[PDB]
Design a binder for this molecule. Structure first.
Ligand code: NA
Length: 129
């Protein structure tokens, strides 16, 4: 599913990401834009052989099982394919664990390089929330 910007902002808000660990909703929308272009089916192989999955590009090195990432963890206890659903529940619940693990949203390289220190409130401008 390719979400609209405001559609994804509303779904992320419903699932409790607005100000989760102090990150405003615009941070999450900005992260999803530059990770996946708001596409739940987005997949991208990493150099280490792991893959990133879904609207927040969650990494099989640590968070999910994709059956092909050796000596990796599954800290969200999910098949990586659950992260490609039209329903972002699994991605949001796993993202909450990730952002709680000490580095906050720096875990998302596109957030650190493209969203951090910017006017992220622009990402929810116009949206009925
Ligand atoms: Na894994």
């Amino acid at each position: 599913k390719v979400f609209g910007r405001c559609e994804l902002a509303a779904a992320m808000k419903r699932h409790g990401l607005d100000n989760y660990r102090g990150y405003s909703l615009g941070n999450w929308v900005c992260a999803a834009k530059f990770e996946s272009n708001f596409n739940t089916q987005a997949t991208n192989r990493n150099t280490d052989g792991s893959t990133d999955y879904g609207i927040l590009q969650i990494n099989s090195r640590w968070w999910c099982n994709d059956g092909r990432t050796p000596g990796s963890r599954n800290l969200c206890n999910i098949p990586c394919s659950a992260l490609l659903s039209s329903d972002i529940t699994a991605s949001v619940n796993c993202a909450k664990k990730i952002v709680s693990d000490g580095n906050g949203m720096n875990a998302w390289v596109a957030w650190r390089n493209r969203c951090k220190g910017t006017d992220v409130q622009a990402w929810i401008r116009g949206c009925r929330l």
